[PDB]
């Protein structure tokens, strides 16, 4: 089950719907894909068969 959503995840008593920074965080996170890194951070293109 895929899930495409950019709504803010709240981690506190105060509700967040469009505010982030103090206890509410944007759910996506970007890889820092560089060729300077070693073996444990390289971008592996993974294809699966079901």
């Amino acid at each position, epitope marked *: 089950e895929r899930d495409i959503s*950019t709504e*803010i995840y709240q981690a506190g008593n105060k509700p967040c719907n*469009g*505010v*982030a*920074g*103090v206890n509410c965080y*944007f759910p*996506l996170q*970007s890889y820092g894909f560089r060729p300077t890194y070693g073996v444990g951070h390289q971008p592996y293109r993974v294809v699966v068969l079901s």
Partner: antibody, heavy 126, light 109 residues
Framework: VQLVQSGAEVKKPGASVKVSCKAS????????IHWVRQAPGQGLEWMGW????????NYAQSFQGRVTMTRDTSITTVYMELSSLRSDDTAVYFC????????????????????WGQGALVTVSS | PVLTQPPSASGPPGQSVSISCSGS????????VYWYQQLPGAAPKLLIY???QRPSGVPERFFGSKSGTSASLAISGLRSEDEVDYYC???????????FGAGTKVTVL
């Protein structure tokens, strides 16, 4: 590194002006460029980006057909033509390089224009 | 869309001054905000990225932060470099691109 660009001069309204930006030193297959103008009496305004390694092109929500953007990978230069120049466009156009790489719409949160280049003032009059 | 900025903010040397930059619900509050300064007759550079950090070659007196849907920048020590203008660069979804502030002029008393 240096990101020198070539300016133009005064010209009649409604024609096409070509501005070019040249890159050197760094590898021109990993970094996006951005095109922002600066007019006297106001601040910066953003137009769009292209990519050196692909045919991606994105436009602002106000300039959909007034500007078309061109890539020259072999010469390591990037070109912009402006179509149907208005009167309130006498500005200084800046070739700006941002670190990283984005093509998607939602990617643009992490980009900042790191290595700017010197701009040139182009004008509209009669 | 665009952001509201004071046209002119000034402060005497020896202490600090603060520059505000408000935003809408989906302009600052979901996206990062960056601070740009430019010399007169020159090209702009980068001062604050990811709302807290600084690049190498920038002194430690330039600090900025945000709490809710607005951000503030504070500079301490105004001798010859803080007379330049500052811009509040961010990103939103309505214009689908980078949006900039009107422009803040900083002077000394």
């Amino acid at each position: 590194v240096q990101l020198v660009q070539s300016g133009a001069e005064v010209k009649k309204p409604g024609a096409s002006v070509k501005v070019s930006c040249k890159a050197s030193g760094y590898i021109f297959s990993d970094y996006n460029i951005h095109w922002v103008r600066q007019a006297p009496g106001q601040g910066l305004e953003w137009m769009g980006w292209i990519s050196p390694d692909s045919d991606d092109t994105n436009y602002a929500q106000s300039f959909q057909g007034r500007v078309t953007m061109t890539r020259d990978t072999s010469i390591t230069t990037v070109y912009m033509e402006l179509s149907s120049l208005r009167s309130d466009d006498t500005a200084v156009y800046f070739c700006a390089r941002s670190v990283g790489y984005c093509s998607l719409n939602s990617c643009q949160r992490w980009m900042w224009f790191d290595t700017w280049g010197q701009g040139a003032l182009v004008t509209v009059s009669s | 869309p665009v952001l509201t900025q004071p046209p002119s903010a000034s402060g005497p040397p020896g202490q600090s001054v603060s520059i505000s930059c408000s935003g809408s619900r989906s302009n600052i509050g979901t996206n990062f905000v960056y601070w740009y300064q430019q010399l007169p007759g020159a090209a702009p550079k980068l001062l604050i990225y990811k709302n807290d950090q600084r690049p190498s070659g920038v002194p430690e007196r330039f600090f900025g932060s945000k709490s809710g849907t607005s951000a503030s920048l504070a500079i301490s020590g105004l001798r010859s470099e803080d007379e330049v203008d500052y811009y509040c660069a961010a990103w939103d979804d309505s214009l689908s691109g980078h949006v900039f502030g009107a422009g803040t002029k900083v002077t000394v008393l």
